[PDB]
Design an enzyme around this catalytic site. Structure first.
Site, short mmCIF file in Angstrom:
data_model
loop_
_atom_site.label_atom_id
_atom_site.label_comp_id
_atom_site.label_asym_id
_atom_site.label_seq_id
_atom_site.Cartn_x
_atom_site.Cartn_y
_atom_site.Cartn_z
N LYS A 17 0.82 -1.20 0.00
CA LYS A 17 0.00 0.00 0.00
C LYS A 17 0.86 1.26 0.00
O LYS A 17 0.62 2.19 -0.76
CB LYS A 17 -0.91 0.02 1.22
CG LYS A 17 -1.66 1.34 1.40
CD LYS A 17 -2.31 1.44 2.77
CE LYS A 17 -2.91 2.81 3.00
NZ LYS A 17 -4.01 3.11 2.04
N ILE A 436 -26.41 16.38 3.48
CA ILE A 436 -26.52 14.96 3.79
C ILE A 436 -25.88 14.49 5.10
O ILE A 436 -26.14 13.37 5.54
CB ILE A 436 -25.99 14.11 2.61
CG1 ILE A 436 -26.80 14.44 1.35
CG2 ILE A 436 -26.08 12.63 2.92
CD1 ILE A 436 -28.31 14.30 1.54
N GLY A 437 -25.07 15.32 5.74
CA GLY A 437 -24.50 14.87 7.00
C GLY A 437 -23.22 15.51 7.51
O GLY A 437 -23.24 16.19 8.53
N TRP A 553 -21.02 -3.73 6.28
CA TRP A 553 -19.65 -3.28 6.37
C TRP A 553 -18.91 -3.75 7.62
O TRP A 553 -18.07 -3.04 8.17
CB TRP A 553 -19.61 -1.75 6.24
CG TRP A 553 -19.98 -1.29 4.85
CD1 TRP A 553 -20.07 -2.07 3.72
CD2 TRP A 553 -20.22 0.07 4.42
NE1 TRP A 553 -20.33 -1.28 2.62
CE2 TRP A 553 -20.44 0.03 3.02
CE3 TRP A 553 -20.28 1.30 5.08
CZ2 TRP A 553 -20.70 1.19 2.26
CZ3 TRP A 553 -20.53 2.46 4.32
CH2 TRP A 553 -20.74 2.38 2.93
N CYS A 635 -26.68 5.81 -1.14
CA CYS A 635 -25.75 6.15 -2.20
C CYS A 635 -25.98 5.37 -3.49
O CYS A 635 -25.19 4.49 -3.85
CB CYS A 635 -24.32 5.92 -1.71
SG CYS A 635 -23.98 6.56 -0.04
N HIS A 687 -18.11 14.69 -5.37
CA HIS A 687 -16.93 13.89 -5.68
C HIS A 687 -15.98 14.66 -6.61
O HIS A 687 -14.90 14.18 -6.97
CB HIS A 687 -17.35 12.56 -6.32
CG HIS A 687 -17.94 11.58 -5.35
ND1 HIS A 687 -18.79 10.57 -5.74
CD2 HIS A 687 -17.79 11.45 -4.01
CE1 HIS A 687 -19.15 9.86 -4.68
NE2 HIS A 687 -18.55 10.37 -3.62
C1 LIG Z 1 -17.63 3.69 1.48
N1 LIG Z 1 -17.23 2.32 0.96
C2 LIG Z 1 -16.51 1.37 1.75
C3 LIG Z 1 -16.51 0.05 1.07
N2 LIG Z 1 -16.18 -1.05 1.81
C4 LIG Z 1 -16.49 -0.92 3.10
N3 LIG Z 1 -16.43 -2.16 3.90
N4 LIG Z 1 -16.81 0.02 3.79
C5 LIG Z 1 -16.66 1.27 3.19
O1 LIG Z 1 -16.63 2.46 3.94
N5 LIG Z 1 -17.65 -0.13 0.32
C6 LIG Z 1 -17.86 0.57 -0.80
C7 LIG Z 1 -17.64 2.04 -0.53
C8 LIG Z 1 -16.67 2.69 -1.54
N6 LIG Z 1 -15.30 2.23 -1.40
C9 LIG Z 1 -14.39 2.87 -0.61
C10 LIG Z 1 -13.48 1.90 -0.12
C11 LIG Z 1 -12.43 2.28 0.74
C12 LIG Z 1 -12.27 3.64 1.12
C13 LIG Z 1 -11.14 4.07 2.07
O2 LIG Z 1 -10.93 3.45 3.12
N7 LIG Z 1 -10.45 5.14 1.65
C14 LIG Z 1 -9.32 5.80 2.34
C15 LIG Z 1 -8.10 4.90 2.61
C16 LIG Z 1 -8.01 4.41 4.06
C17 LIG Z 1 -6.78 3.53 4.26
O3 LIG Z 1 -6.68 2.51 3.53
O4 LIG Z 1 -5.97 3.88 5.13
C18 LIG Z 1 -8.89 7.03 1.53
O5 LIG Z 1 -8.43 8.00 2.17
O6 LIG Z 1 -9.03 6.97 0.28
C19 LIG Z 1 -13.18 4.62 0.63
C20 LIG Z 1 -14.24 4.24 -0.23
C1 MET Z 2 -21.82 7.95 2.71
S1 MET Z 2 -23.34 7.96 3.61
C2 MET Z 2 -23.32 9.60 4.38
C3 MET Z 2 -22.71 9.61 5.77
C4 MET Z 2 -22.74 10.98 6.46
N1 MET Z 2 -24.14 11.39 6.73
C5 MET Z 2 -22.04 12.01 5.57
O1 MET Z 2 -22.72 12.96 5.15
O2 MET Z 2 -20.82 11.84 5.31
ZN LIG Z 3 -24.34 8.99 -0.07
#
Ligand SMILES: CN1c2c(nc(N)[nH]c2=O)NC[C@@H]1CNc1ccc(C(=O)N[C@@H](CCC(=O)O)C(=O)O)cc1
Ligand code: MET
Ligand SMILES: [Zn+2]
Ligand SMILES: [Zn+2]
EC number: 2.1.1.14
Length: 746
Positions: A17, A436-437, A553, A635, A687
């Site tokens: 990583k 949204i939050g 999750w 989402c 995004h």
């Molecule tokens: C919210 N998501 C996420 C996932 N998988 C799980 N179990 N839970 C999640 O929060 N399901 C799909 C969705 C989109 N995919 C993802 C997957 C990983 C990251 C994530 O952890 N991003 C961090 C890196 C953290 C690290 O590895 O230290 C980043 O800063 O990009 C974000 C979105």
């Molecule tokens: C990705 S679902 C939203 C979670 C939270 N309410 C936020 O706005 O980040």
């Molecule tokens: Zn969302």
């Protein structure tokens, strides 16, 4: 013997990583990357080798993704990358994987029903395939040199096509499978070199065979594995399948493919295949029994697994039965040895990748007549303590034994005739605004209250003066993870220190662990939500995560049905909803971000899931007032195949995605549906670091007022603003408020 279908490639401490990220930033060179890579591969091989593993996978390692790996193998790089041919290297690979400062990366989608994401191939009649990547054979020789002979793993030629998608322009009539003639030639060149290297076993991953496939598609496999037969000559060929059971017609095709001599079956998530096996299995063909779960974190039930494997030895056993993992260990954490905090008792109930390699081997030995008695005794003991421990089973188990009161529909008062007692308690301008939050994060430090309070009055004082925004939020500063924040306050949970799982690229997730019966001991939100609703005279919405998302999750306990655990979570959340109310929170938001993630792969299994999933949501707020307004967030932007479930959730107001789809598709909320109830699709794609002028938003808004009735249409972002930067959210939200006041003037 023993076998592992695949293995994680991030490293015990996510070595790959940081190497990847380091290389991408420029703080290291390509050679530094390859050193780290070749090292990780060496230790993995040697590791499985020393465990006594007979069939050790080759080519499971990947710098980003295994499907992108095959795309490179077939020289199928999209045009925009300006590739000219020849052995593909780091440049073109990551160019496709993550894109560069001018061309976009390739799309990534969910890999089956796992938490993993692959890079979708962009195919069409114009692409000129070619053998452009010798990764497979290279790794085979590399491992050969180290003294460990491996089984090369390739994604089957037909699954590869079925997992792909036609590139832009490729007309509607195009049928992807029409490319088999172009890629088969290359699969042969690879297989041939593999043989020349001394490979005597090969593994073809054809997981699509566990999907619901029409007869014309199944036949495509047949034709392919007959067209490959002569090349597979003098080679043991194992075709793998995982994540579910194999449909009967699918089982017929599979078990009679030419060249194939072994069959891999998921017997944790697709034991249903067993009945087809008993009814009839080929002659002297090997059966790779995937009984060790490669998708979870629990220690195997050596005892049960044994009884099974033995019964299977019955069907063959002539040294044709091979112990294996249900799927690639890619989908589980690396080593349980790096868990220094979790208490002995709980750890004895777990097992990670490295531990699973061993289980597979102990089970193999036991069938050979060399049962390591000391191993099975600790196992049985750990299993006993798990089934006895009062940290697991609990009286929450009775509270749930009551939720069988038919449905849990919210106190009649039809939503439409409930939004009235709500606008009575609230009163808001048509076409209302809100978020949204969450909001962007700043410094961040690990008294404590006063520091958190400040960050909120900032988000509150902002929302108010931020033109307006009728419905505010506290920003979720006291929350690091939307799922963990809560799990840390529930009873059936446990948290790991290093249990990372690869999600995509260099990004991983460390899922919470639901080991026993969950229950919310004390008030979780409340404090913060109550405090925020006082710094303003506007509505403050409480924030919670639905029970479905928290379940999906996390690494859920494999001793009871998912739903059963889900309903327990729903009961605990139900309290907070009722305490947020007693606290004075009249608007409560409950997000179900991963609602669609637990969707079975078998289409006929969808109904049952969507049911208990949606029910779980209702159990959450079924006992809330009529003046209390419930909001849900998901989402997604495609619902043509799930709309009735969104309606059966019975929410006062719901917020999904859109923001980059037709506001026309929103007519799935009208025709033959007549939703009628709060709803508001995204106008600001959170995004993208760019601003969307008050004109673009005020436009999408009218476009919806055209379809979705105006009487109950809301105006909100696309999601939270956590990943955004205050300099991007600041103006973008302003416009959204104006764009509303504008159309409000109408
Ligand atoms: C919210 N998501 C996420 C996932 N998988 C799980 N179990 N839970 C999640 O929060 N399901 C799909 C969705 C989109 N995919 C993802 C997957 C990983 C990251 C994530 O952890 N991003 C961090 C890196 C953290 C690290 O590895 O230290 C980043 O800063 O990009 C974000 C979105
Ligand atoms: C990705 S679902 C939203 C979670 C939270 N309410 C936020 O706005 O980040
Ligand atoms: Zn969302
Ligand atoms: Zn229904």
């Amino acid at each position: 013997a023993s076998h592992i279908v695949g293995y994680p490639r991030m490293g015990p401490k996510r070595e790959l990583k940081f190497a990847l990220e380091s290389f991408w930033d420029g703080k290291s060179t390509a050679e530094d990357l390859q050193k780290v890579s070749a090292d990780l591969r060496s230790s993995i091989w040697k590791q499985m080798s020393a465990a006594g593993t007979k069939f050790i996978p080759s080519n499971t390692f990947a710098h980003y993704d295994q499907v992108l790996d095959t795309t490179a193998m077939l020289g199928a790089v999209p045009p925009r990358y300006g590739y000219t041919g020849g052995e593909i290297g780091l440049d073109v690979y990551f160019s496709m994987a993550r894109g560069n400062a001018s061309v976009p990366a390739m799309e990534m989608t969910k890999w089956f029903d796992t938490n993993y994401h692959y890079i979708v191939p962009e195919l069409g009649p114009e692409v000129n395939f070619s053998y452009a990547s010798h990764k497979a054979v290279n790794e085979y020789k590399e491992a050969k040199a180290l003294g460990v002979d491996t089984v090369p793993v390739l994604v089957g030629p037909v699954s590869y096509l079925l997992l792909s998608k036609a590139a832009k322009g490729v007309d509607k009539s195009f049928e992807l499978l029409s490319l088999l003639p172009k890629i088969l030639p290359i699969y042969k060149e690879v297989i041939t070199e593999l043989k020349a290297a001394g490979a005597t076993w090969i593994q073809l991953d054809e997981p699509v065979l566990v999907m619901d496939l029409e007869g014309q598609k199944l036949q495509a496999f047949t034709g392919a594995y007959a067209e490959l037969e002569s090349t597979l000559s003098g080679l043991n060929v194992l075709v793998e399948t995982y994540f579910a059971d194999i449909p009967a017609e699918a089982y017929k095709t599979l078990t009679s493919l030419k060249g194939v001599t072994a069959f891999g079956f998921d017997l944790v998530r697709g034991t249903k295949t067993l009945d087809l096996v008993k009814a009839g299995f080929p002659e002297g063909k090997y059966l790779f029994a995937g009984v060790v779960d490669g998708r979870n974190i629990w220690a195997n039930d050596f005892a049960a697994s044994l009884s099974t494997l033995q019964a299977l030895e019955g069907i063959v056993g002539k040294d044709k039965l091979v112990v294996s993992t249900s799927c690639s260990l890619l989908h589980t954490a690396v080593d349980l040895i790096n868990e220094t905090k979790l208490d002995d008792e709980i750890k004895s109930w777990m097992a990670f990748a490295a531990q699973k390699v061993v289980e597979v081997n102990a089970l193999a030995k036991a069938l050979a007549g060399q049962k390591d008695e000391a191993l099975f005794s600790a196992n049985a003991a750990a299993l006993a303590s798990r089934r006895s421990s009062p940290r697991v089973t609990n009286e929450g188990v009775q509270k749930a034994a009551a939720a069988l009161k038919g449905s849990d529909h919210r106190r009649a008062t039809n939503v439409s005739a409930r939004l009235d007692a709500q606008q009575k308690k609230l009163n808001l301008p048509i076409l209302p605004t809100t978020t949204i939050g969450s909001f962007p994060q700043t410094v961040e430090l690990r008294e404590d209250y006063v520091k958190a309070i400040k960050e909120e009055i900032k988000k509150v004082v902002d929302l108010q003066e931020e033109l307006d925004i009728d419905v505010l939020v506290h920003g979720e500063p006291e929350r690091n993870d939307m799922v963990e924040y809560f799990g840390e306050q529930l009873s059936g949970f446990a948290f790991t220190a290093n249990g990372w799982v690869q999600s995509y690229g260099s990004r991983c997730v460390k899922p919470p662990v639901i080991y026993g019966d969950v229950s919310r001991p004390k008030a979780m939100t409340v404090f913060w939500s109550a405090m925020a609703q006082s710094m303003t005279s506007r509505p403050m919405k409480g924030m919670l995560t639905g029970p479905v998302t928290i379940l999906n999750w996390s690494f859920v306990r494999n001793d009871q049905p998912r739903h059963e655990t889900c309903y327990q979570i729903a009961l605990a959340i139900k309290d907070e909803v009722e305490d947020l109310e007693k606290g004075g929170i009249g608007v409560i938001q409950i997000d179900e971000a991963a609602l669609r993630e637990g969707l079975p792969l078998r289409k006929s299994e969808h109904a049952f899931y969507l049911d208990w999933a949606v029910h779980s949501f209702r159990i959450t707020n079924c006992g809330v007032q009529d003046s209390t307004q419930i909001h849900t967030h998901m989402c997604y932007s495609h619902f043509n195949d799930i709309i009735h479930s969104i309606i059966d959730m019975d929410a006062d107001v719901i917020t999904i995605e859109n923001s980059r789809s037709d506001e026309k598709l929103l007519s799935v909320f009208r025709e033959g549906v007549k939703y009628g109830a709060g709803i508001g699709p995204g106008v600001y794609d959170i995004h993208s670091p760019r601003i969307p002028s008050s004109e673009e938003i005020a436009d999408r808004v009218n476009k919806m007022l055209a379809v979705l009735e105006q009487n109950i249409l809301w105006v909100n972002p696309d999601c939270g603003l956590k990943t955004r930067k205050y300099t991007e959210v600041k103006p973008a939200l302003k416009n959204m408020v104006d764009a509303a006041k504008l159309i409000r003037s109408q």
